[model samples]
Target: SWTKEEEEALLDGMDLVKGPRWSQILELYGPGGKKSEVLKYRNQVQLKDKARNMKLFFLKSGQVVPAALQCVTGDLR
Candidate 1:
């Protein structure tokens, strides 16, 4: 029931704000959209980006990645 265009709009909005200001994101990008959708999608992208960034951190530092449910609490924030 959604399109990639909306996805990108919210994504770019997120970048413009540089963090999860969902209300602002929706305002800037969701003139005709819903706050629920924008906020949820932002969280989805957040999880993907977080995982990607964490993996990259290990690779860049030549460190082994945490496996399974294993992870440092400090790794999360």
Candidate 2:
């Protein structure tokens, strides 16, 4: 787990207004900096890792959003 200070430091250095790619999202949130699963629907890509319990949705515009977190205990349907 990241400490409050560490989280703040990370967020502070980030440009929230800027968009991110799937690779970037994986870099930030994936376990061992690797993508465990990738789903494609239409033109979008849903990247996820059950072990890390994290999911990121990537669009064509290179924008990525945290679709889910701590999803290990729930159904992601």
Candidate 3:
């Protein structure tokens, strides 16, 4: 199971980054998505899969979005 930190970092990367740059996200945010010695074993494919899963989860859970994206796109929803 993915840890909370890992999920958080993944979500942040999704919001901050422009696209599905899996490798870039992994480089910027470790498997744990921070500077710490922990479970850093996920590969790029896993990262991509996890992101896909997360997106699906969001759809089922609700239409949630980050505020930063509003400024980045200069559009409101």
Candidate 4:
């Protein structure tokens, strides 16, 4: 449950920051935000921001993207 101000902070912060480093932005922009909350918020925007054909996985610096698994439903593989 985000306050109107909190919601605006998340959206506006994403516009400027794009992705990553939620810790600082949360403190600076999100006001009473917690680290995990901002991290979760970042995850949401990353999914929204990623190109339709793009897939990202944060692993070792040189790790290859693995095959997609059959998940629950909705969207695509």
**Top candidate by lDDT:** 3
lDDT of 3: 0.58
Better of 1 and 4 by lDDT: 1
Writing each residue's lDDT as its tens digit, candidate 3 over 36-77 gives 423257787776666566555555678774442222232112
What does candidate 1 score on TM? Answer: 0.33
In model 3, state the lDDT of residue 18: 57
Candidate 2: regions farther than 4 A off: 1-19, 34-44, 48-77
lDDT of 2 by residue, 1-77 (tens): 88999998778765453333555655544544455423322121444333222332233235653454422233444
Candidates in order, TM-scores: namely: 0.33, 0.21, 0.46, 0.25
For lDDT, candidate 1 versus 3, the one ahead is 3
Model 3, stretches more than 4 Å misplaced?
1-19, 31-39, 65-77
At residue 2, give the lDDT of candidate 3: 100
Q: Ten-residue segment with the worst summed lDDT in candidate 4?
A: 68-77
lDDT rank order: 3, 1, 4, 2
The CA lDDT at 20 in model 4 is 40
The TM-score-based order of candidates, best leading, equals 3, 1, 4, 2
Model 2, residue 62: displacement in angstroms?
24
The predictions' CA RMSDs to the true structure, in order, are 13.6, 12.7, 14.4, 13.8
Q: Write the per-residue lDDT of candidate 4 for residues 1-77, one digit (tens) a residue.
A: 78999999999986776534435555643445554343344443444343222433223234544443111113423
Off by over 4 Å in 1: 1-42, 69-77
